[PDB]
Amino acid sequence: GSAVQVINASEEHTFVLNEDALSEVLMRDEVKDRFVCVVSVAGAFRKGKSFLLDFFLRYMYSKYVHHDATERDTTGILMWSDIFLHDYPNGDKIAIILLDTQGAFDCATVFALSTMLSSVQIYNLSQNIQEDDLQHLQLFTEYGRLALADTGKKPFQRLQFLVRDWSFPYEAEYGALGGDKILKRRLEVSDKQHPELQSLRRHISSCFTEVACFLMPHPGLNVATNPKFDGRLQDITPEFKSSLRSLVPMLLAPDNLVYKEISGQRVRARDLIQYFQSYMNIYKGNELPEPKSMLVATAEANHLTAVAAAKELYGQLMEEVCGGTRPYLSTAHLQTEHLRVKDKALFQFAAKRKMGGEEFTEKFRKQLEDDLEEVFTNYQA
Ligand SMILES: Nc1nc2c(ncn2[C@@H]2O[C@H](COP(=O)(O)OP(=O)(O)O)[C@@H](O)[C@H]2O)c(=O)[nH]1
Ligand SMILES: [Mg+2]
């Protein structure tokens, strides 16, 4: 059809990455600018995830495109082949990504990826915001708390508690007005004497730019209880549809378009392909052990990305000004000219600022020099 959803990982029995696959799309000339949205939905299998998404399209394909008319046996996460570009004026230039968790679910421990990798997380919850649901949000409030000391800047931007089939609008009215009555409660109250480490209601704010909750009307017994739905639009309750119209926009079009911001700085799309394979290593270990750091893995991709960011620059400053149509023959101070570009590759490397440590970071520029300086010791003399 018009577009497909590409797998990124599998599971049974290992936990492969489809490196090419992810790469075979992000690298399209949406190589940029600003990965960003990066909107994801996750949570309870068949609490209607891959459906809220399916309206994210049949209602986005038409504010970015035609402005009027017109995981079967594997987990991992989805990406739609289509991607939604923008913008100007003071932008950006922004690609738009949709991920839809799925597959081996029986929240099935692949909500961290789909959150580590996301500028807008939609925790797709049912009935109520329970405590168990609140307990899956631990391994970030610590991971980030470190980072809070470390980077100094809150990782994670927006988490959207989405309550599907909320059923007492008389206490709290459907939508954002009541999303933030219910939420505010359940992060007061049982912060008072009741649970132990889930008392991370105290740390949450710090680790997210925006945390907000939304309450959905039950759609209807006919959608809820039917195998392979289509019917018609009437077949859905008006209360649902009226909510979408407040929902989907609320999230989409800028500035509800949320900038993916590692360290404290936006990121292009060509760098996701890094962050994707980086985390994914220390997930089920790549060997055995987890988690909390995490901060090892984020920094180590926070960093190796600037290397490849300031190595592309090297060539694309050297073999043009210092080579190519006037090639590889002595001057004898192309060296002097190469020092310049090497310097540029370091003087303009320290873009300010990534993160990871001190002896941990500069470890890399040690290997920029020794990987930059390996053209001075070249090529065929
Ligand atoms: N109760 C309820 N059911 C829904 C809602 N939205 C979709 N469904 C039903 O959920 C099923 C599909 O869920 P789906 O998104 O594919 O599974 P998931 O991706 O794993 O969450 C179908 O029966 C839909 O009728 C909702 O808001 N409430
Ligand atoms: Mg699904």
Residue numbers in the entry: 3 to 72, 92 to 127, 135 to 409
Can you provide the manuscript's text about this entry?
The merging of ER membranes, i.e. homotypic fusion, is required for ER network formation and mediated by a dynamin-like membrane bound GTPase family known as atlastins (ATLs). ATL contains an N-terminal GTPase and a three-helix bundle (3HB), followed by two closely spaced transmembrane (TM) segments and a C-terminal tail (CT). Moreover, purified drosophila ATL has been reconstituted into proteoliposomes, and signals of lipid mixing in the presence of magnesium and GTP provide direct evidence for membrane fusion mediated by ATL. ATL-mediated fusion has been shown to require GTP-dependent dimerization between ATL molecules in apposing membranes, and GTP hydrolysis drives conformational changes in ATL.
Residues 1–422 were expressed in E. coli, purified, and crystallized in the presence of GDP. Similar to human ATL1, the structure of Drosophila cytATL revealed a GTPase domain and a 3HB connected by a linker region. In the GDP-bound dimer, the GTPase domains interact with each other. The two 3HBs dock to their own GTPase domains and point in opposite directions. This configuration is very similar to form 2, or the “pre-fusion” state, of human ATL1. Notably, the dimer of Drosophila ATL was observed with GDP, but the similar dimer of human ATL1 was seen with GDP and a high concentration of inorganic phosphate. In addition, when average B-factors were calculated for the GTPase domain and the 3HB in our structure (37.84 for GTPase and 60.59 for 3HB), the results suggested that the 3HB exhibited significantly higher flexibility. These results suggest that the 3HB of ATL may adopt more than one conformation upon GDP binding. The active site of Drosophila ATL is mostly very similar to that of human ATL1, where conserved residues from four signature motifs engage the nucleotide in the presence of magnesium ion. Notably, R48 of Drosophila ATL points towards GDP, while the equivalent Arginine in human ATL1 (R77) points away from GDP, and forms a salt bridge with a Glutamic acid in the pairing GTPase.
